[PDB]
Each structure stands twice: as structure tokens, then as C-alpha cells.
């Protein structure tokens, strides 16, 4: 089980809930109280997933799907198979996720590192909760959320997105996309630069940070630096997910129409609004 340097870190301590009862490892994995709380929610959520596969009748991954409570059921509880089973799997998934992160804060504490990984991961949890909880609520029903199935949830995205015409026009969705694209560019650049300075032309000595600052300053005229690129990678990633969730919780609540009609505030803006020419004149 152990890495060759691991032993000196499996020290007792750093447990949020439960003292040393749960402070042990199972192979590589650390347990902890939230380890057991993540398993209870994981197993229960997948048992109740196998239950919608039976109540629907298939055993195939592509087909087994689990739907949200229809629009008649609004925001209140619903009957199992007719939306209600999804509601319990959603609670399951939420506590499994919030337990996974809280399990990570224990691991951070035993290791004496920053809490940054749980924190970055809460953004993902909150983007899920936007689509599954916060926007459903504002809109008045659990039926507005996606279904838990490999293809039917893609079908949820096409259908939700085209209710506003071409959803590309959603301005916060443009900002989100930009951050996902700039983030993958950055990831590409950061991985490539570090590997080019550790794996230089064959024969040569390993390069240094200096060289990296010099390659990017030479290429682009700027080097954000070996600390700035980790910081940038964190803010690009979380900014993507922030804006992504912001564009969905603004939709169907603050905006009902075709998103392309939104940009007419820039055009119907007085002074240049009634000049003929261009496209909107």
C-alpha cells in the first residue's frame, strides 16, 4: 500500500468530526468520518439509480435515465418513478459531493497544506446545484432540472438551450466559454513550458525557471511567472464554472425570450439607434 515516502505522513490527527474512530486508511484511500458519509451517500444513490432502471425496465447505460418531477408536481414532493426517486438521488448526490470535499479538508489538515482543492471543488458542486436546485426553485419547479442519464441529459441541454433560440447569444455563456477556452490554452501552455524546461533538447542540462520566463517573454513579451500560472489556472477554471452557472441562473427567471433579442439594448440605445446603414439600420 504505501509510497516510499508516505509513512511519515500517516500520523494521527486532522479530523473534523469523529476523533480517531474513523482515522484510518483502506489501501491508498483515507477514510475519515466523511469517507463513511461519502460511501453511504454513494451506495444509496446508485441503489436508488438501479431502482429507476427496474421501474423503467432497462439495464442499458445509454437508456436508463431517472427523470425530475414533472411541472404539475411544482416544487413540492413527488411520487417515486414519477419524479420522486430523482429527488432522493439528488439529495444523495449532494451529500456525497459535500462529503467528498469535506473528506478532502481532513486530508489537507493531516498534511498541513492549504484548503484550496476543496474550495475549488465547491464551485463545481455549486454549478451542479444551480442546475439541480437553485434555478429549479426560482422557476417554481423541480421539472426544470436535468435528468440523470448519459444521453437524456444531452437532450436536456439542446432543449433548454433552444428554448432561448441560439443560446450562444447568452452573454454570460459567452464569458463562460471564453474562460473554458483560455483555460485549455493556458493548461496547454503551462504543461508544455514545464516539460520543455525539464525535458530539453537531448544532451543538455535541465533548464531553469529563468529560461521559462525567457521563453515566454521572448514569445509573447510577457511572463506571468511560475506562481502566476497556477493562480491563473485556478482563476480561469473557477471563473469558467462561475459564469457558466451565472448564465443558467439568469435564464428562465431574469430572461425568458430568445437570447439574441437581448443585444438589441445596445442597438435601440438612442443617438446611434436610428441612423440607416450597418445591419440594424
Amino acid at each position: 500500500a504505501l509510497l516510499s515516502f508516505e509513512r511519515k505522513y500517516r500520523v494521527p490527527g486532522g479530523t473534523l468530526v469523529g476523533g480517531n474512530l474513523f482515522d484510518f486508511w483502506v489501501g491508498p484511500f483515507y477514510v475519515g468520518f466523511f469517507g463513511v458519509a461519502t460511501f453511504f451517500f454513494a451506495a444509496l444513490g446508485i441503489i436508488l439509480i438501479a431502482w429507476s432502471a427496474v421501474l423503467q425496465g432497462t439495464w442499458n447505460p445509454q437508456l436508463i435515465s431517472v427523470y425530475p418531477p414533472a411541472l404539475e408536481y411544482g416544487l413540492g414532493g413527488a411520487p417515486l418513478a414519477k419524479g420522486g426517486l430523482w429527488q432522493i438521488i439528488t439529495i444523495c448526490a449532494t451529500g456525497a459531493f459535500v462529503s467528498w470535499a469535506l473528506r478532502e479538508v481532513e486530508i489537507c489538515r493531516k498534511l498541513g497544506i492549504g484548503y484550496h482543492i476543496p474550495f475549488a471543488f465547491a464551485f463545481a458542486i455549486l454549478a451542479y446545484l444551480t442546475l439541480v436546485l437553485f434555478r429549479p426553485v426560482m422557476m417554481g419547479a423541480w421539472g426544470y432540472a436535468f435528468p440523470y442519464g448519459i444521453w437524456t441529459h444531452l437532450d436536456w441541454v439542446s432543449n433548454t438551450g433552444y428554448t432561448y433560440g441560439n443560446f450562444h447569444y447568452n452573454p454570460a455563456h459567452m464569458i463562460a466559454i471564453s474562460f473554458f477556452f483560455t483555460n485549455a490554452l493556458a493548461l496547454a501552455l503551462h504543461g508544455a513550458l514545464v516539460l520543455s524546461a525539464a525535458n530539453p533538447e537531448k544532451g543538455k542540462e535541465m533548464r531553469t525557471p529563468d529560461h521559462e520566463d525567457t521563453f515566454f517573454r521572448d514569445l509573447v513579451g510577457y511572463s506571468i511567472g511560475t506562481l502566476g500560472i497556477h493562480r491563473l489556472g485556478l482563476l480561469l477554471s473557477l471563473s469558467a464554472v462561475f459564469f457558466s452557472a451565472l448564465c443558467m441562473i439568469i435564464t428562465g427567471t431574469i430572461w425568458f425570450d430568445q437570447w439574441v433579442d437581448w443585444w438589441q439594448w445596445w442597438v435601440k440605445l438612442p443617438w446611434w439607434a436610428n441612423i440607416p446603414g450597418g445591419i440594424n439600420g
Binding site: 504505501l2 511519515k8 505522513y9 500520523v11 489538515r109 511567472g225
Partner: protein, 248 residues
């Protein structure tokens, strides 16, 4: 059909690539050992890869990874259950012994080098041309611990020359000695810098530098080990959020 063939061979590629990548991240820490140090029976479904050699600049030698593991220094820790999968409690003081969150690695006891072969980190007195270019300057401030007692006085910032940034604060103690605090562990307020990780009594136990104008990589790792170690271990002596503002 071409598309069907394309997607088929893609998954063959991604299986070979996850295989490649994961054998490549087996170049340190593996082979796996049992809690006693002897090679563990389950070695994992991936084979260790053939040695890679790095050529290290300015007479540092080479690195051949994987190799025999660089751990050697006594670990002051005893097993807490007969069965595998349990904590190993400190036999002494974890802060002193270099264990748990106060762990340090026996990194090369020589300074990190820059592109030209000169020390990367250097005290700002001796870092020609360096000054504080923005933000509140901590040189001169009283330094406080988590017991909310004055631990020292900042007497210089240790600067990374090639990368131009604050790596460490240099802190004069009650007895006119010095220590290094990691910058990313101190908090520069306006009338003070607060080190949360250490209560004042523990400041003296911060591992010292032998040469007063350079830090070696072994010393840094010992310093950073011990400051982070204070989050779990100096916890009895740490006054809460309540007493911190009450403190004003």
C-alpha cells in the same frame, strides 16, 4: 465506415496514453512498500518504466528516476495497530522529529540555483537593486503568533532574484537571533505581520540556517515543514477568531 474506425482506434490510443502517463507518474514513490519498509505484495497493474536521466546544471550532477528511494533519516513514529492501515503516532515531538505535517525531506543541502549559477534566494540587503515596489512593507513590523504574543521583529525580506518576489521574512527573535518565515504562511497586516501557524514560544524551535546569507534546499524544507506543522500541533496554544479582534 471511416468514422467508426476513427473512434475505434481513438480508444486504443487513449488506453495506450493513460498507460503511458500513469507509468510516467510512477517515477517517484514506487515500488510500493508495506508499513514496515519491505516491498508490498500488491504492486499495482502498471509496470515501473525504464530509467530516465536528468542532467542537473552547474555541478549538481544527475537524477535517475526511478532509482533506490532517497529516504534514510530516522522517522520518529510507532505503529498504532497490529494490522495494516493505521496511524503511526509520534514517539517524541513531531515538530522536532520532522514528522507528520512537520515532515521535511532530505533535499540537497545546497541553495537553489538560478540561470547563471548564483543563489536564487538572497536577503534583500544583499539583493542588489531590490526594493519593495508595492503594498505594505513588513520590514520593521512586530511579528505575532497564534497565542497573540509578539514573537519577533521582521529585519529583512528574502527575495527570489530571477523571479523577483518575496520568498521569506527574516525575523529577529527575543534574543537577537534570526529565523526564516515562509511568506505564504505569514499575513502582512498594517501595524503587524501575523504568523497563525506558530505561537510565540515555538518560534525559537524554527530550524536555523548555518550560513547567514543563503538558505539551502534542505534548510527551506526543514523550515517550511516546521511552520506548516504548527497548524495541527500548536493548536492548544491558538486563540480563536473571537480573541483576535478582541485583541484590538
Amino acid at each position: 465506415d471511416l468514422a467508426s474506425l476513427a473512434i475505434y482506434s481513438f480508444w486504443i490510443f487513449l488506453a495506450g496514453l493513460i498507460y503511458y502517463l500513469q507509468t510516467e507518474n510512477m517515477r517517484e514513490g514506487y515500488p510500493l512498500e508495506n508499513e514496515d519498509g519491505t516491498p508490498a505484495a500488491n504492486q499495482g497493474p502498471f509496470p515501473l518504466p525504464k530509467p530516465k536521466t536528468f542532467i542537473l546544471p552547474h555541478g549538481r550532477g544527475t537524477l535517475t528516476v526511478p532509482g533506490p528511494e532517497s529516504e534514510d533519516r530516522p522517522i520518529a513514529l510507532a505503529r498504532t495497530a497490529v494490522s495494516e492501515g493505521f496511524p503511526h503516532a509520534p514517539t517524541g515531538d513531531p515538530m522536532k522529529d520532522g514528522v507528520g505535517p512537520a515532515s521535511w525531506v532530505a533535499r540537497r543541502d545546497l541553495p537553489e540555483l538560478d540561470g547563471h549559477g548564483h543563489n536564487k534566494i538572497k536577503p534583500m540587503k544583499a539583493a542588489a537593486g531590490f526594493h519593495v515596489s508595492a503594498g505594505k512593507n513588513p520590514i520593521g513590523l512586530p511579528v505575532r503568533g497564534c497565542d497573540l504574543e509578539i514573537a519577533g521583529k521582521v529585519v529583512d525580506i528574502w527575495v527570489d532574484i530571477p523571479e523577483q518576489m518575496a520568498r521569506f521574512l527574516e525575523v529577529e527573535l527575543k534574543d537577537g537571533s534570526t529565523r526564516l518565515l515562509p511568506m505564504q504562511m505569514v499575513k502582512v497586516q498594517s501595524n503587524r505581520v501575523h504568523v497563525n501557524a506558530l505561537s510565540s514560544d515555538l518560534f525559537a524551535g524554527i530550524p536555523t540556517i548555518k550560513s547567514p546569507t543563503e538558505v539551502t534546499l534542505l534548510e527551506e524544507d526543514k523550515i517550511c515543514g516546521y511552520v506548516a506543522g504548527g497548524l495541527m500541533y500548536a493548536a492548544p496554544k491558538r486563540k480563536s477568531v473571537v480573541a483576535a479582534m478582541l485583541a484590538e
